[PDB]
Symmetry: D2
Subunit: 371 residues, 4 copies
């Protein structure tokens, strides 16, 4: 069966898997805060079933449920991803992410050592390809890519940045160029922002590559959460993260729109990150079913654009069984006492004194009737 580059170079669509840590937190197996993957040893059956759900939804990639006991967890996670990839038309991808910010670790040699430790496990397990994901600094992302290409395996690289660029101020087009130069054959974005914002960022990255005359496959794994209110830091800074994000979750129609837009933009590795559940992955695969020539196994429990409803007893329910209905319906929040957007949080008693001095001037103007 085909490897990752053989698929992409043949013009195929590679469907990603969804958001493991977020989905498993909801199912009771991951702890928000650490977000660590010990479930791979503690409850492998849960991890295995979620891989299998994504595979059934049409995923071509099983990302390893791994992190930086210890290597026992990582090895176990690799073995589960392998078992499931082998049950269908999927590859295993070993990922690395930016190093933790609460660690002292920060030199090039030491940051690279961290990436090498993780790669060790992935080489021994013989993963199909490698992903450098979840990088806010392109500098650090370049080091990860430099380290991983050495393996002799294809390397994808995604950054968690939006249109404003990385956390130094490096614009996305430039970030993309830098990653391709370091040897990444697949580039794009993951996490932090919704699909709309994510694709704006990938457009900039592609435009960076088009000027500069470089070739690279394009990749997107956005949040399944609507984040029109995000600043450049992404969704963590929203007041609702992580336990109040429910209202923002994409419908399967939102994701069909994303998958079409992504495809139209030239993205051929089309996936999703936090908030993506199996039905969201199926949406990608259904939207692009005519281009691929087939539906995923999960579509046997679905219908095109609500067709499963076309014999409901209620006329107004049957009338929903059309693309035009679902594509255009402005769904309600069910929370009329709540706002539709939030201001991101971010970074004194002198201001309270100044306030108090001004309050008193106005009070006096009014009380002295100075009209």
């Amino acid at each position: 069966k085909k490897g990752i580059l053989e698929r992409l170079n043949a013009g195929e669509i590679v469907i990603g898997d969804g958001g493991f840590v977020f989905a498993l937190e909801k199912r009771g197996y991951v702890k928000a805060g650490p977000w660590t993957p010990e479930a791979a040893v503690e409850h492998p059956e849960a991890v295995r079933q979620l891989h299998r759900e994504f595979l059934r939804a049409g995923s071509n990639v099983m990302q390893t449920f791994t992190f930086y006991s210890g290597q026992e967890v990582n090895e176990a996670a690799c073995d589960i991803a392998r078992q499931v990839a082998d049950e269908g038309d999927a590859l295993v991808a070993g990922g690395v992410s930016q190093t933790p910010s609460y660690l002292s670790c920060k030199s090039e040699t030491e940051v690279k050592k961290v990436f090498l430790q993780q790669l060790e496990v992935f080489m021994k397990k013989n993963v199909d390809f490698l992903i450098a994901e979840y990088f806010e600094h392109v500098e650090e992302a370049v080091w990860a890519v430099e380290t991983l290409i050495a393996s002799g395996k294809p390397v994808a690289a995604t950054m968690c940045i939006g249109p404003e660029g990385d956390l130094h101020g490096v614009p996305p087009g430039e970030c993309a160029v830098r990653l391709v130069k370091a040897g990444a054959s697949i580039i794009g974005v993951n996490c932090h922002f919704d699909p709309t914002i994510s694709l704006k960022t990938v457009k900039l990255m592609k435009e960076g590559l088009e000027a500069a005359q470089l070739k690279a496959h394009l990749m997107s794994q956005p949040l399944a959460y609507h984040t029109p209110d995000c600043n450049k830091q992404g969704f963590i800074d929203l007041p609702e993260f992580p336990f109040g994000l429910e209202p923002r979750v994409a419908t399967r129609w939102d994701i069909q729109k994303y998958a079409r837009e992504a495809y139209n933009l030239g993205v051929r590795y089309i996936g999703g990150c936090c908030g993506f559940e199996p039905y969201h992955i199926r949406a990608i695969a259904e939207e692009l079913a005519p281009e691929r020539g087939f539906l995923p196994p999960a579509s046997e429990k679905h219908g095109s654009w609500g067709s499963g409803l076309d014999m409901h007893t209620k006329p107004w329910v049957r009338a929903r069984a059309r693309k035009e209905y679902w594509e255009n319906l402005r769904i309600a929040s069910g929370r009329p006492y709540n706002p539709s957007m939030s201001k991101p949080d971010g970074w004194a008693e002198l201001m309270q004194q100044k306030e108090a001095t001004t309050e008193q001037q106005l009070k006096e103007l009014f009380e002295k009737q100075k009209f």
Copy 2:
């Protein structure tokens, strides 16, 4: 292991499981429209793991994933076996469920209806379920027929109706609905589906009062939707334009469900569960909210914290500051869809200026 009545007669809280057909639809194993449970045979591994998630979240009841190239009998037998396997992995009972006869499948007389319930009861007796639930009834008449059939089993019967404060679809009010169910033999009554927790508990209150006026005692049960439905009319969420594929925004947070669980408890509800939309973290929220009353946490709480406490070691001070009940309890969360309304209306049925 204590039976359902021994628990409830002792003043204990019985946490229900969540919404199987909605949860499995999202995971790829149930088709919206028929909503049938053939996964119990085709993908028992998916069904088993979802029962296990609810058990881990604190559920004391595994509802059989039942209904009605594969027969109803086959599915139902397989569903019972899976529910039992997982009930035996913790402090849980198996409930054999029947619901109203399906709306897409023929008009049935009282006799024809009762045969249908008898066919399902035969499996539940063969498998020795712990108790029986008649749920998803919109008409009290049919609900009563189910209860009359089920109580012949010798096992306890719970009965819940998918109705709101205005009553059943023939216009019978909830108080009277509750009275007729208890008279038919049900020892637990309440509501499930169609309405959010707030509306559901309004309905349960009217049921309680009807029982009090009738001098009748029965345990109270609530399995509401996890979806906010302040815009529903008496027909319930099916008539919302967003049913079933646009309901995402309305999904309750865990905090919303904690609030539900406390309200429920205060009203006198002691079988506290959930229906369509309830995922495992939602069940965890019931169990956490009522942990002081019960004396323990569910296993899933090991991958959680009280009211955001898991965030108390985050790098960013503003994320750390979210680690408190006061924060989450009061945070009015944003929809993320500013081009969209907050409520939807349910579906149903010149020349003077020239001068």
Copy 3:
């Protein structure tokens, strides 16, 4: 020049259009102080009061309500004179109003003292408005009918009834029996809720086999989030009500609905500006036979826009567009509804809740820690 009286118009089946909300409109213009809401402008700036009465006249109003309250008496005499002046410039009558007062003997002497000026000034009819207790409203009506002039009576209550718990039906019945020839509601609630209340009032009269004309002067503010106490208890009252203001289309909807319910004196209270009154008159123009003078600076359902350069603006020039457009708030960081304020719990009820909360907090912390162990 001779002019049909209020009952002559109503008995003949005609639509009487009210004026809008004086205190609110004049507060926005700089002549009334929110808090007291008193009408000293009638002497301090009579030109402002005159011009607002004129605007309502031009919009279609058949009633100039006097801009009156409980110097003092000279303010009320001046207000009556201005209302008279303006009523005489068009097809309008002067209505002298009395409101609830901040002992039966002692309260009726407040109303009597008010009625004196209205009799001296020879108002066309009398209005008992803004009453939250039907008991006191009936006293006003009793005092007022003794003038021999027609008396309308409106309550600021919703579908749950008056502040002593008396339902709207019973309220209407009582008021007709005390001698009111016109009854209904004003203020506190939006047009939708207001018409629910009138419908109950109506049903109450029918059940009593009584007869009276029906009137409505609702808020121009949307209040889906009100409780029985009305808009004052909303967190936004009175300086944050902007978003809630009705469009002229909302008011046309209201006018048709009121007409269809049997309301024949159709006006408005706080928030109604002149273009809202124009909406009532434009909506019921087929029924009345004519348009008000202000329609000369308007068009039916956006027709004035049909000459815009941009095609999308021109497409707005019809009824189906404005009738179905779900207009945006422009405030995405804000909610769509607010919880009304009210009596809290007692201190100490609250301090007891806090102590329990703190106990429970520690019980939860210990439970999580012990499981963790």
Copy 4:
């Protein structure tokens, strides 16, 4: 009585008046569509009284209710504006706006209006509501020949004029043409307006040119506008009610304008007399006095401190009103709207359509087969 430049050169705040055509449309005197000011002859009492409300609210400028009958309307409007200006500490500004075609032909239209303004001896001239900086520069060139000060404001946002000229450049060109006051009016809410004025100011600093700054934004919230401004919003002009600023919103604007170095602080469509009062109240400590309309008001809700209900009294503070996220009262309606616009060509819509149609037909047969 000090003229416009004497006030501004001395560092004083000049408070503008509000939005005449919109306010008078609501009162029954102006027709939406033509938006013409014939009320100046038909109902002078209505125009006069609105001028008087703005004066009472603190306005230091009465803008003439004028347009391009005709000269008679404009003569009457000038006389009414002067009458009211003479009743307080206010000046009369003669306005010219973009024409509804060659340079000298456009300049004839400006010259014809300037003739009335010179005959009436206005205090200063305003070229306002221009979408092309080229036309605005022509206005300014014609108007400066009067020998009176000229202000120039454009109805553009941060993305610049309709020929793509950005705001920094627009400003520099208006000041080079002889405008001593520049800024923006209309089309956008106050937040977006001040973003534009910030760019204008930066353009002047970089070109080393000096001018006084002026802002006359909408009183409507327009976070959903594109660069064409509010006319393209689906609600323009009969559904804009929900968006209207509170007096607190305008106090926030007045403070931000001031901190940016704006000293001619006014408003455009949607500004009513209480919005102007809000500018004057916010800036009252910097000016040393309150407008006369504040006699019928209080600081930040203090007029409520005597209400019968404790929760109403509790509203009588800045901390309350400044932080209250007021509700829309329309839960079945959205918070924003997509602007209307040209969209895509007829043939592209044709293409896009059949492409989408085809996809859906293929999907249908994939489902039927598997």
